[PDB]
Design a protein around this ligand. Structure first.
Ligand SMILES: CCCCCCCC
Lengths: 36, 20, 72, 69, 52, 69
C-alpha cells in the first residue's frame, strides 16, 4: 500500500516544483518586457 | 508488480534529483 | 585574414543543426572514418497519453542534441 | 541547406505538464521559423556583399589603369 | 588620451603637472575598477562543488 | 576551496526519463572534475604570476637604484 502513496506524493512534489519554476519564469519575462 | 516497482523507484529518483 | 576566415568556417560548421542543415554519410565517412586516424474510466486515460507524450518529447530533444554533438 | 484527494491531483499535474510541453513546442517552432528566415537573408547578403566588393573595387581603378597601359 | 597629451606636456623633471597627476589618478581608478570587477565575478561564479 | 499496450509504453517512458538523467549525472560529475582541475591550476598560476610580477620588477631596477645610493 504505502509504496503507492510514496510514488503518489513524489509525483506531487514534482508537479509543485514545476508549477513553481514556471512562476519565476513568468516574472523574468515581465522583467524582459520592462527592459524592452 | 515488477514494472510498478521500477516505476515507483524511477519517480523517487526524479524527486530526489529535484530536491538536491 | 586567412585564420579569421578559418575561424568563421569552423564556427559555421560547429553550430549547424538538423533544422538548418542535413549531415550526410559522405561527410561523416569523409571526416569520421580515416582522417582522424591519418591525423591526430475517463481519468485512467490521463497518464496513458500525457506520459507517452512527455517521453516522446524527451527522446526528440535528446536526438536533436546528438545530431549537434556529431557536428561539434 | 534543408529543402482519493491526492490521487486526483497527480493526474491534473501530469496533464498540466503535458499542456505546458505542447505550448513550449509551438513556441519553439515559431522561433525556428524566424531563425531560418534570418539565415536565408544572411546568405543572400553574403553573396550581395561579395559582388559589391568586387564591382566597386574594379570600378574605381580600372579607368586609370587602362588609360595608362 | 595619454597618447594625445604625449606631445604637449613640458619634459622637465622638477615636478609633475597637475594634468598628468589627474590622468594617472583616473588611470589607477580604472585599474582598481577592473580588479574589483574580477573579484565580483569570482564571487558570483562560486558554487558548493568548489567552495564552502 | 572545497577540500494494456499503453501503460507499458508509459512505464517504459518514465524508466527512460530516469536512466537518461542518471547518465547525464555521471557525465556532469566528470565535467566537474575537469573544471576543478582547471580551477586548481588557475590558482597555482595566480600565485606564480604575482611572484614573477614582483621578482622581475625588482630584478630590473634594484642594481642601478642601489649603486646610485
Ligand atoms: C512524471 C515525470 C515528469 C518528468 C519531469 C522532468 C523535469 C525535468
Amino acid at each position: 500500500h504505502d509504496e503507492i502513496k510514496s510514488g503518489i506524493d513524489s509525483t506531487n512534489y514534482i508537479v509543485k516544483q514545476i508549477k513553481e519554476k514556471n512562476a519565476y519564469d513568468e516574472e523574468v519575462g515581465n522583467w524582459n518586457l520592462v527592459g524592452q | 508488480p515488477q514494472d510498478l516497482k521500477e516505476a515507483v523507484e524511477a519517480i523517487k529518483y526524479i524527486a530526489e534529483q529535484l530536491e538536491s | 585574414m586567412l585564420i579569421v576566415m578559418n575561424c568563421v568556417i569552423v564556427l559555421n560548421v560547429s553550430l549547424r543543426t538538423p533544422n538548418t542543415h542535413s549531415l550526410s554519410e559522405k561527410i561523416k565517412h569523409l571526416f569520421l572514418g580515416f582522417l582522424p586516424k591519418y591525423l591526430g474510466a475517463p481519468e485512467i486515460k490521463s497518464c496513458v497519453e500525457a506520459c507517452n507524450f512527455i517521453a516522446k518529447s524527451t527522446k526528440e530533444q535528446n536526438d536533436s542534441g546528438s545530431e549537434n554533438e556529431n557536428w561539434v | 541547406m534543408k529543402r482519493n484527494p491526492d490521487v486526483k491531483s497527480a493526474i491534473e499535474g501530469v496533464k498540466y505538464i503535458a499542456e505546458h510541453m505542447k505550448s513550449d513546442e509551438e513556441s519553439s517552432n515559431a522561433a525556428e521559423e524566424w531563425k531560418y528566415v534570418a539565415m536565408v537573408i544572411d546568405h543572400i547578403l553574403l553573396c550581395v556583399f561579395m559582388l559589391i566588393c568586387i564591382i566597386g573595387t574594379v570600378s574605381v581603378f580600372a579607368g586609370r589603369l587602362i588609360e595608362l597601359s | 588620451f595619454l597618447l594625445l597629451l604625449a606631445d604637449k606636456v613640458p619634459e622637465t623633471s622638477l615636478s609633475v603637472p597637475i594634468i598628468i597627476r589627474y590622468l594617472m589618478f583616473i588611470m589607477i581608478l580604472v585599474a582598481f575598477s577592473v580588479i574589483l570587477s574580477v573579484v565580483v565575478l569570482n564571487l558570483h561564479h562560486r558554487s558548493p562543488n568548489t567552495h564552502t
